[PDB]
């Protein structure tokens with residue numbers, strides 16, 4: 097079952113990155129990516145989202161994160177949170193780092209993302225490895 | 241199903257190594273490793289083994305390959321074929337390269353091995369990568 | 385395109401250096417070539433454009449060799 | 457021992473640098489610590505004794521931190 101893999105990889109990414117909040121995002125419909133859901137999270141939810149309304153958020157494909165991901169690169173920023181399911185600017189988040197993951201047919205299917213509320217985090221080189229390992233394993237799983 | 245994973249990884253190792261003959265070996269009973277079976281093979285069987293009698297061969301743990309593997313290293317040789325299910329010396333084999341794989345509880349559970357009848361093969365550094373990638377994936381699978 | 389750009393370069397390299405040379409192209413031969421390329425890439429995704437192009441050629445060549453596929 | 461020697465060094469490092477400091481050791485706390493160590497190692501096996509010892513300490517420390525486990 098796919099989210100079994102998602103939640104197990106996320107737990108590892110969360111602990112190794114020492115993030116304050118982490119999530120796996122999933123695009124729908126397949127190959128079209130008009131919407132994005134949080135299908136797994138670790139840590140404390142940002143105040144601007146609730147345990148309700150974690151799914152069905154529209155995807156803005158002109159956002160830098162979307163295009164950087166399709167260039168095969170990870171994305172970080174201090175203020176742009178494209179798929180976080182709220183339009184509120186959420187200044188309590190100091191930092192975000194994400195990588196794409198691709199489904200079994202190599203289609204951009206979602207992201208693995210870590211967030212920090214504090215302003216101290218480990219280097220992007222270590223975050224790159226943590227994220228890429230999980231994307232490699234999530235990329236081999238299916239949807240029952 | 242475990243051998244589904246075994247046969248799929250073996251097919252990749254065979255093609256990328258360009259071996260003449262390749263196999264996955266499985267130890268039994270678990271944690272004890274008195275016997276070793278070929279549970280998957282690609283290419284032409286050596287003449288000294290048949291499509292019958294590919295299982296139940298005794299394991300000689302004093303052989304270098306066994307101890308080198310438990311030291312966390314790959315093994316190669318021009319003349320020692322410890323788990324090949326025959327006592328015949330089989331001089332038609334010019335070269336063998338193997339790596340261990342470990343089950344979900346990190347117990348030495350078998351090997352992935354490539355053989356050449358010709359005397360030309362790609363470098364051990366490339367064979368190391370091919371083998372380690374497959375061991376990493378086989379090490380995550382279970383026994384239904 | 386919504387595709388893993390490293391897989392795409394890897395796959396396109398295999399197509400243009402090897403598969404296009406297949407004497408007997410068919411549905412089945414394209415399905416078997418893609419199944420091998422995808423499974424191989426999913427096993428160990430390449431990370432550089434240059435390495436993806438390199439590895440897509442080599443891997444497809446080895447597939448053509450080991451599978452005894454009629455070229456020219 | 458029949459064990460992956462890289463996992464063993466990785467696990468022993470986590471035990472001796474972190475787990476042994478747990479205030480409330482129990483069956484459940486040992487099962488949860490091993491489940492985390494094994495899943496983490498299986499996700500990305502370390503390849504050097506030195507790195508395995510390093511990563512077993514760091515990973516166990518992060519597990520202790522992020523899980524808010526009483527030390528001393």
Ligand SMILES: [Cl-]
Pocket residue numbers: 232376377
């Ligand atoms: Cl891997």
